[PDB]
Amino acid sequence: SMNPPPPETSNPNKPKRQTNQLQYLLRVVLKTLWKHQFAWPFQQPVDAVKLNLPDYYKIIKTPMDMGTIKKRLENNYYWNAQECIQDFNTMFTNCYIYNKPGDDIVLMAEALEKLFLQKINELPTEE
Numbered sequence: 001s002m003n004p005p006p007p008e009t010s011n012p013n014k015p016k017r018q019t020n021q022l023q024y025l026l027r028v029v030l031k032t033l034w035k036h037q038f039a040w041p042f043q044q045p046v047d048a049v050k051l052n053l054p055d056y057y058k059i060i061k062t063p064m065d066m067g068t069i070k071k072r073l074e075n076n077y078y079w080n081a082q083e084c085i086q087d088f089n090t091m092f093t094n095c096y097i098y099n100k101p102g103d104d105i106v107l108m109a110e111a112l113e114k115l116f117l118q119k120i121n122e123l124p125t126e127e
């Protein structure tokens with residue numbers, strides 16, 4: 001069995017910014033979700049080998065996880081907040097697309113997503 005290469009977290013020729021909205025996405029959004037009791041399935045790329053999900057990457061073609069997002073934020077990979085927000089939304093959507101409706105992992109994603117939406121609702125104005 002095999003996993004794909006993980007998503008990109010470093011690219012020296014991608015232009016980058018450090019901004020107050022991106023700072024909020026690390027300090028408030030990522031940190032809030034990371035510490036949650038249901039974060040663990042989402043803290044690293046899905047390991048389809050260890051988890052015995054041989055069809056995962058047959059179904060999910062845009063993988064994303066909070067480990068990747070954390071690295072992107074810490075290594076200032078993004079230009080804007082919308083790129084990062086999109087990564088969170090991709091992660092949640094993948095979970096809902098792959099899993100059977102009602103499963104434990106879906107409930108976990110929903111709990112994280114509720115907090116995500118609450119924090120993004122108060123994304124600060126650009127300075």
Ligand SMILES: COc1ccc(-c2cn(C)c(=O)c3cc(C(=O)N4CCN(S(C)(=O)=O)CC4)sc23)cc1OC
Pocket residue numbers: 040041042046047051052053054094095098099105
């Ligand atoms: C380090 O531990 C974990 C990491 C990731 C997941 C995990 C993450 N995400 C995002 C998922 O979508 C996901 C689905 C999983 C799973 O075990 N499933 C759903 C798919 N089926 S199946 C039969 O359709 O392949 C098996 C059960 S584990 C997991 C679960 C872990 O341990 C419980």
